[PDB]
Each structure stands twice: as C-alpha cells, then as structure tokens.
Amino acid sequence: KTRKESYAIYVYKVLKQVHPDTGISSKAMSIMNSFVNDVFERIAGEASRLAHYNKRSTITSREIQTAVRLLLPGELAKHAVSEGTKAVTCYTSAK
Amino acid sequence: RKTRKESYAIYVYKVLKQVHPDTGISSKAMSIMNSFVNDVFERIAGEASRLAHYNKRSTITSREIQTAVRLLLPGELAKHAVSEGTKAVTCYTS
Amino acid sequence: PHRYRPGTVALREIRRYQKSTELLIRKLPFQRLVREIAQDFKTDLRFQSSAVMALQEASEAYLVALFEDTNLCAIHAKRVTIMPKDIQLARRIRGER
Amino acid sequence: PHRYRPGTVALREIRRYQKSTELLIRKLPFQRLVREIAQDFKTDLRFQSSAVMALQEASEAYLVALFEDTNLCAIHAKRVTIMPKDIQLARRIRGER
Amino acid sequence: LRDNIQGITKPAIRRLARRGGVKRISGLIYEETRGVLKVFLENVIRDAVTYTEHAKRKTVTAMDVVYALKRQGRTLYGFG
Amino acid sequence: DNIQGITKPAIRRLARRGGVKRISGLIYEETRGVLKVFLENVIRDAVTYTEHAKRKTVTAMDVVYALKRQGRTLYGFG
Amino acid sequence: KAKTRSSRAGLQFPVGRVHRLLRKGNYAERVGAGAPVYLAAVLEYLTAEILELAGNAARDNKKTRIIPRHLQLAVRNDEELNKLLGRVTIAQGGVLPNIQSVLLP
Amino acid sequence: RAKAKTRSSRAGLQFPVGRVHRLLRKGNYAERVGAGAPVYLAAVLEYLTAEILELAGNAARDNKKTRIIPRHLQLAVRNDEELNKLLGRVTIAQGGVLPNIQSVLLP
C-alpha cells in the first residue's frame, strides 16, 4: 500500500495508436519503462552541462534542442526536432 | 585590468616545494596539473551526488564522499586516500 | 551404422541455440558460485532471487559477445578451431587486459 | 658501395621516433584539411590557433594507437607486413565498425 | 569452499560457444573461460556490496546489481 | 583535394612511432579514410557547441568538450 | 476549467510530471516553460518508433502480443537505433541468426 | 572580532577548503552540503597531487633536468600501475609514448 509511478499507461496508449489490434506483456512493458527513464536522464544531463558551460541558470527549449542534436544520430534527430518544434508551436498558439 | 581567472597554480606549487625542495615546473605542465585536479573533482562530486539521490537524501556528507572515493579509485590508492581524508577531518574537529 | 559426417550436428546446434532465448547455465551451481565469491567481501550476506537472475543474464551476455569476437580472430588467422590466444588477442584489443 | 641490410634503418627509425615528442604531420596542410571539411557544416567559420593544435594532437594520438593494435593483428597472423584487413579487424573488434 | 568454479560444466561452455557461432573448439578454452568469468563476476560483486553497505542493509537487491553494471559501462534493461 | 596533403612519408612516421617494421601499399588510402571519418565526427560537435553559444569563432574549449563527449579527454588546452 | 497541458500541446505523455522531475532532480536552478513540452514530444516520438518496429516482427512470427525477443529483433535490425542502444543488454532477448561463410559446407 | 584562521590551517592542509565548499554549493549537486565534506575532499585531492608530483620529479632528476615538462608526467603516469588505470582514457598533450618493440621484429 504505497504508490510507485511508471510510464505503463502512456506506452499502452501509444501502442494503441500505432497498432490498434495487439497487446504487450509485462516484461516488455518493464523494458520500455527502463528505456524511457534512460533516455530522459541522458537528455536532461546533457542540457544541464550546456547551461553550466554557458554560465547561465535556466534550462530552456533551446538547451533541450541542442542536447537532442548532440545525442541522437541524423535522421532520427531531424524528425525529433520537427516533432518537438510542432508541439511547442501548438502549445503557445493555444495559450 | 583584466577579468580574474581562478586556478590551482599556487597550491600545486606549494605541494611541489614540500615534496621536492629544488625543482621547478613549466607552464604546460602546470596546465596539465590544473586539468587533472578539475577532472578528479568532477568525477568524485558527480558520484557522491548520484548516491545521495539513490538513497533519497538531500545532503552530501563526508560518508558519501568516502563511498565515492572507494568506488572510483583502484585498490591500494583508495586504501591510502581514505586514510588521508579521515586523518584530516579528525585534525579539523579538535 | 548411420553416422553423420563431423560438422553437421555442430551446424544444426548453432541454428538451434541461436533460435531460442533461455538460460544456458544451470542455476543452482551458479547461485553457489555467486555466494562463494561474495563471501570474501562481507560475511553473511543475503541475496534476493532477482539479484541472482540479473547476474546470470549479464554474465551470459558477456560470454556470448566474447566468443563472437574470438571467432573473428580465429578466422583471421586462417583456421577454424578456436584457441586461447584468440581470447587473449580479443581481450587486449578491446581494452580489458 | 656501403648499403645496410633492409630492416636496420627501419629499426633505428622506430627507436628515434619513439624517443621524441613532436608533431609528425606538417601543419599548414592539416589546417587546410580542417577548414575544408568544416566548410560543409557552416559557411565562413573562423578558427583559433589552439583549436587547430588541439585537433592535431588528438588525431595523431588516435592514429598511433590504431597502428599498435594493427601490428598485433599482423603478428597474430604470422606475418610482418601490415595489410589493410588488419586495420579492418582492429576497428571491428574495438567497436567502431 | 573450494569448488563451484568447477560447477560451470563443459557442455555449458559448449552451448555458449554455439550461441556465439563457433564450430570447433579446443580443449584449453574451458579453463580460460572459467578464469574470464571469475574476474568479471568479482568486479561486479564488489561494487554491489559497496552500494549495499552504504545503504546500511544486509540484502543485495536487484537495483544494486543494476547500478554496479551501469558503472561498468553495461546497461541492463528489464529489472528496474 | 587536401586529403592528399597527408603525404606518404607522414603516415610512415606515425607507423614508426606505433612500432611498425614493414608497411604495404594500400595502408595509405585506408588511413586517409580513417582520419577523415574521425575528423568529421569531432568537428560536427565542435560546430554545434559554437552555434549554441551564438558565436562565429571556434575556440579550443569547444574542441575539448566535443572530445570529452566522445570519451577521449585531452589535457593541456584549458 | 481544468485542462491538462498534454491536451493543450496535443501529446500523450504527461507534461506536468516531466516538469516535476526536472524541478526535483537538481539539473539547474530554473526550469523554463517549453522545456517539458519539447521533451515530452521527443520521448513520445522515440517510443512510437520502437513500438512500430516491434509490432511488425510480432506479425512476422504470427503473434498478437509483443515479447522481449521481438523488441530485440526490432532494435538490432534497425541502423540508427542500434547506434543509440549500442551498449545495452535487453533481458531474455537472445542474438541474431549469424553464421560465417567459411564455416558452411 | 577575533583573529581569522582559514579552515585549511585548522586541518593542516595546503589546498583551500573555502573554495571547495563554494564550488560544491554552486555546482548543482545537492541541496545541502555538510561540514566535513570539503575537508575530506581537499585532503584526497592533495594526496593524489603529491603522489603524481613525486614520480614526475624523480623522472625529471633522472633526465638531468631541473624543471618538469609534459614528458615526465607521461612517463610517471604510464609506468605506475594504478595511475595508469585511473588515467586510462586520457591523452596528455606533448607527451609521446613508451619505448616498446615486439620480440619477433628484431633479428
């Protein structure tokens, strides 16, 4: 009787968007949870070292963007930059 | 008039004149020693921060620094670094 | 009377064990090995079960990758049989010894 | 009339270049190489001098370590002459290709 | 205790070598492989016990093994 | 173009410092390919740090940070 | 009145939890406004790419449920995902079917 | 209102304790920083610095020199076993290599 937060239901929603007629077991859900935490900590640490190198005190979307370009390889990086910019535009225009 | 640059030149020079009283050091070797001190500082500080995050604490004490030194240095070098740190804290308190 | 030419059962065991996903070491001897070589660090430790399963996963993966690089060294020397100096060359180029 | 047996000048050049510490590449051609293959990322960049010196240090150290591991591969194949498949074996065991 | 490095038998090394893709094996590979495995396991067990002693416990959990392997440069998904 | 400015005697001197007795004749083209791949992967990250810092000059600290990301850690240049 | 930020940005991952985990884990002193939105978009894209490759292998082995073997095959057959997940061991995954040619009869 | 005694003198060190305490507070490691942690860390950094400068000064004496250049740091690090394991993936500029010719190459 104590709470432990994870990413299970969100991975389940993304799976029901791409393949509407399949499921996932518990072990593969544990693997996907570990993958999301791994990539989160890697991008966040890179953005923090950028903000420390430039003598500033704020992590912004430009730091997150440059961390994505340094961390991911080419075509994957271009599609990730496109998706993030589209989300930030749709968030500010729907203020 | 320029903007100041903090370094570790004078302290490395003090340690050198304790350990070899008739020996100098050039500029490039002092730059290498400065980079070495910064590197080892950042390794030990990052590992102690990660231990304090794993155990759900908010404080970096000397016990996290001891465990980080023990994880990060190899063998007898860790065996002597632990002794030097414990001896300095004991002399600092009294 | 019927015998296969030597090499055939080796090739089909290669296919059979690259098709499956299971543990290839017995687990009570591996658990005894872990507890023994942990006894020289702290007396009377008390392992879980998922800790021993995680150690067995990691050890199996390490040995399989080492054998792939060893096989490439032995093919480079224009042989087929793997010898221990191939293991030594692999672990010294990789940066372990 | 006087000529050395082939191998002797090679061994003493090995000793002569392992004794010194200097840059073994000319630096105006290396600077032109750096500016050329940086021109395809951002037009009209402006390098310092210590940046080009740092790149030359790092590149020289990388190539020397690659040649040591290549030499060990060629000795493992019971040869003396280094061939490019030794370079390929070294860079694939190491984890680069 | 003196055994249990002998408990890693010699059809098991054969099965690991065939998942690796190996057709013909010598007869000294067995002792060489036992030495390799004992060195790797010692380096991981030492860091796991260090994390356990710092946490002031007496049991080695799965997360201590995961953190030790992550320090080695070998990430492991599926147990966190 | 300028990759031919990494001449034949220079690769030979790097091989002599590596401890190499006798060299074939295709090592030169193989080595020029290897050096070009390494320099592309480092200069890409150095230019990315420079573009984030809103500059037009590539400093030595950008090279040091890129090499530290690769896992190489040069001492002596800041 | 209570709309979530994820519905405003049009996403599936949470934005409030990403903002809490950025403010709580000692990365910098201040955290902006578009940072959790950008990072949730990036994580959603990477998750969708992995699962899109995994479901096709689950079809090819004629299954309706994903397992770590299917995740292993999906990662290791792709090129850039194999460079992202370069030194990573996936539990209960196995290897790829590789046999050298000089060993074949 | 008393006489100021720096925390390095109170512990018997040579590296600063106040600067290390500031760089831990202003470096985003944790919220709170204890009292004995910079004293412990300055002791460890002084030990490693003295341990490398001993060997570098010995090599500089053996080459009939007075000062220390990066070649002597290279020889000092690469000859010790544990300093070599600590500084394993590190390039020292203007350092060179160690003399090593394989056995099957010389007649």
Curated annotation (Swiss-Prot), chain B:
The organism's place on the tree of life at top rank: Eukaryota
Q: What is its main location?
A: nucleus
Per UniProt, subcellular location reads as: Nucleus; Chromosome
Provide the alphabetized UniProt keywords. Acetylation, Chromosome, DNA-binding, Glycoprotein, Isopeptide bond, Nucleosome core, Nucleus, Phosphoprotein, Ubl conjugation
Q: Which residues are glycosylated?
A: S83
Glycyl lysine isopeptide (Lys-Gly) (interchain with G-Cter in ubiquitin): where is this cross-link?
C91
Gene Ontology MF term list: DNA binding; protein heterodimerization activity; structural constituent of chromatin
Give the record's PTM text: It fluctuates in response to extracellular glucose, and associates with transcribed genes.
GO CC terms, sorted:
nucleosome; nucleus
* Function of the protein: Core component of nucleosome. Nucleosomes wrap and compact DNA into chromatin, limiting DNA accessibility to the cellular machineries which require DNA as a template. Histones thereby play a central role in transcription regulation, DNA repair, DNA replication and chromosomal stability. DNA accessibility is regulated via a complex set of post-translational modifications of histones, also called histone code, and nucleosome remodeling.
UniProt record similarity statement: Belongs to the histone H2B family.
Q: What does the subunit section of this Swiss-Prot or TrEMBL entry state? A: The nucleosome is a histone octamer containing two molecules each of H2A, H2B, H3 and H4 assembled in one H3-H4 heterotetramer and two H2A-H2B heterodimers. The octamer wraps approximately 147 bp of DNA.
Q: What is this protein called?
A: Histone H2B 1.1
Q: What organism is this sequence from? A: Xenopus laevis (African clawed frog)
Q: Which residues of the parent protein does this chain contain?
A: 31 to 124 of 126
Curated annotation (Swiss-Prot), chain F:
Q: Which residues carry this modification: N6-propionyllysine?
A: K8, K21, K54, K56, K68
List residues, modification N6-lactoyllysine: K8, K54, K68
Task: Please give the superkingdom of this protein's source.
Answer: Eukaryota
As stated in the Swiss-Prot or TrEMBL entry, residues carrying the post-translational modification N6-butyryllysine are K8, K21, K54, K56, K68
Q: Which residues carry this modification: N6-succinyllysine?
A: K8, K54, K68
Q: What does this protein do?
A: Core component of nucleosome. Nucleosomes wrap and compact DNA into chromatin, limiting DNA accessibility to the cellular machineries which require DNA as a template. Histones thereby play a central role in transcription regulation, DNA repair, DNA replication and chromosomal stability. DNA accessibility is regulated via a complex set of post-translational modifications of histones, also called histone code, and nucleosome remodeling.
Q: How does it assemble?
A: The nucleosome is a histone octamer containing two molecules each of H2A, H2B, H3 and H4 assembled in one H3-H4 heterotetramer and two H2A-H2B heterodimers. The octamer wraps approximately 147 bp of DNA.
UniProt protein name: Histone H4
Organism for this UniProt entry: Xenopus laevis (African clawed frog)
Tell which residues of the whole protein are contained here.
25 to 102 of 103
